[PDB]
Amino acid sequence: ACPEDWGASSRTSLCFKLYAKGKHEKKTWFESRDFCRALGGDLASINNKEEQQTIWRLITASGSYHKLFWLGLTYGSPSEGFTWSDGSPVSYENWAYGEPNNYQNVEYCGELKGDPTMSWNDINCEHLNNWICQI
Ligand SMILES: CC(=O)N[C@@H]1[C@@H](O[C@@H]2O[C@@H](C)[C@@H](O)[C@@H](O)[C@@H]2O)[C@H](O)[C@@H](CO)O[C@H]1O
Ligand SMILES: [Ca+2]
């Protein structure tokens, strides 16, 4: 079961919460990770298409599209490539076309484009974004 405002009550329920903020309250990737971890959770990992649907549904209920959200995607070692901050394997991927491209060699964190594509892009970790936590 999920906490109130994070999901449903069934044993298989996955718990996510959107944090959409104005520019003066958006956070870097590391700040967002720390915020979610302070609650006992982490930045959201999207481990399969079912979790993707869950998050997309939350976005539709928000009444706001096209927003960008930090996910728990962070680059590891050169041989690892991208990892999830919660330690789960990156088995499922939904990178946008041509991503991750490490554009200009400065893109080590992953963001979700909150539109129907639900696609991922690697971007500079110091950008200020909205974020999604899990618990
Ligand atoms: C898919 C791809 O390689 N896109 C390149 C562009 O990078 C993309 O857009 C920028 C603004 C940033 O969001 C990147 O994280 C993203 O991958 C790049 O700007 C452009 C330069 O001419 O080349 C594209 O191919
Ligand atoms: Ca990129």
Side-chain angles (χ1 to χ4, degrees), residues 9 12 14 41 46 77 89 93 111:
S9 69
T12 52
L14 275 298
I46 302 183
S77 70
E93 59 84 12
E111 66 176 359

Side-chain angles (χ1 to χ4, degrees), residues 11-131:
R11 179 55 179 80
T12 52
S13 295
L14 275 298
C15 322
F16 296 107
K17 187 172 170 61
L18 305 182
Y19 290 85
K21 298 298 190 189
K23 65 193 180 183
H24 293 119
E25 295 181 339
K26 288 183 162 77
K27 288 177 181 290
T28 68
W29 186 89
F30 295 92
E31 292 166 352
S32 301
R33 186 198 62 188
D34 291 350
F35 176 97
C36 299
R37 287 181 174 193
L39 292 165
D42 209 327
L43 278 167
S45 61
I46 302 183
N47 287 140
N48 53 49
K49 70 187 189 291
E50 290 73 35
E51 293 176 18
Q52 178 171 305
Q53 168 66 18
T54 299
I55 296 171
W56 171 241
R57 295 278 272 296
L58 291 179
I59 292 168
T60 68
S62 76
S64 181
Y65 302 96
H66 318 289
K67 293 188 166 173
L68 303 172
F69 295 87
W70 289 127
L71 301 177
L73 288 163
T74 182
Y75 201 87
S77 70
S79 65
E80 279 184 313
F82 273 92
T83 67
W84 289 116
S85 63
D86 75 354
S88 65
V90 185
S91 307
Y92 171 74
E93 59 84 12
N94 201 37
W95 296 107
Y97 179 65
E99 306 294 346
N101 67 350
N102 195 12
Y103 183 55
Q104 301 176 321
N105 301 81
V106 298
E107 304 193 316
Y108 295 110
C109 292
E111 66 176 359
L112 171 71
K113 177 170 296 189
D115 74 8
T117 73
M118 289 288 290
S119 64
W120 311 345
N121 177 34
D122 59 337
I123 200 86
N124 184 273
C125 295
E126 285 65 48
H127 281 198
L128 303 182
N129 267 338
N130 309 294
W131 67 93

